[PDB]
Amino acid sequence: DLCFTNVYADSFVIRGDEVRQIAPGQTGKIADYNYKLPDDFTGCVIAWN
Amino acid sequence: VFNATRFASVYAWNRKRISNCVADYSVLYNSASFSTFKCYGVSPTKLN
């Protein structure tokens, strides 16, 4: 329904238990070191096995 | 407290008093130890 101008998709792979740490405001060896979402982040987090 | 061999039973638990010392919480993030670590009242990273 609502559409956007620029769409950026960051593709990568992580360990199974590390998907819970991807989200705004999360803390951990993921958000802190390798990959981090802004606290104001607006988007969709996707994962599959 | 954390590294003790056997803790007290949850039925009767032992409350350890930590006072007059230096609490270094940076070792937790430098060397991964806790599997589940969360803070309800305060921030996990600001404890130091």
Swiss-Prot record, chain B:
Q: Mutating residue 33 to P has which effect?
A: In strain: Omicron/BA.1, Omicron/BA.2, Omicron/BA.2.12.1, Omicron/BA.2.75, Omicron/BA.4, Omicron/BA.5, Omicron/BQ.1.1, Omicron/XBB.1.5, Omicron/EG.5.1
**Outcome after substituting residue 28 to I:** In strain: Omicron/XBB.1.5, Omicron/EG.5.1
UniProt-reported outcome of changing residue 36 to A: In strain: Omicron/BA.2, Omicron/BA.2.12.1, Omicron/BA.4, Omicron/BA.5, Omicron/BQ.1.1, Omicron/XBB.1.5, Omicron/EG.5.1
Q: Which residues are glycosylated?
A: 3
Effect noted on mutating residue 35 to F: In strain: Omicron/BA.1, Omicron/BA.2, Omicron/BA.2.12.1, Omicron/BA.2.75, Omicron/BA.4, Omicron/BA.5, Omicron/BQ.1.1, Omicron/XBB.1.5, Omicron/EG.5.1
> Impact of altering residue 6 to T?
In strain: Omicron/BQ.1.1, Omicron/XBB.1.5, Omicron/EG.5.1
* Assembly and oligomerization: Binds to host ACE2. RBD also interacts with the N-linked glycan on 'Asn-90' of ACE2. Cleavage of S generates a polybasic C-terminal sequence on S1 that binds to host Neuropilin-1 (NRP1) and Neuropilin-2 (NRP2) receptors. Interacts with host integrin alpha-5/beta-1 (ITGA5:ITGB1) and with ACE2 in complex with integrin alpha-5/beta-1 (ITGA5:ITGB1). May interact via cytoplasmic c-terminus with M protein. May interact (via N-terminus) with host bilirubin and biliverdin, thereby preventing antibody binding to the SARS-CoV-2 spike NTD via an allosteric mechanism.
Q: What does this protein do?
A: Attaches the virion to the cell membrane by interacting with host receptor, initiating the infection. The major receptor is host ACE2. When S2/S2' has been cleaved, binding to the receptor triggers direct fusion at the cell membrane. When S2/S2' has not been cleaved, binding to the receptor results in internalization of the virus by endocytosis using host TFRC and GRM2 and leading to fusion of the virion membrane with the host endosomal membrane. Alternatively, may use NRP1/NRP2 and integrin as entry receptors.
| Name the UniProt record assigns to this protein | Spike protein S1
Part of the intact protein present: 341 to 388 of 1273
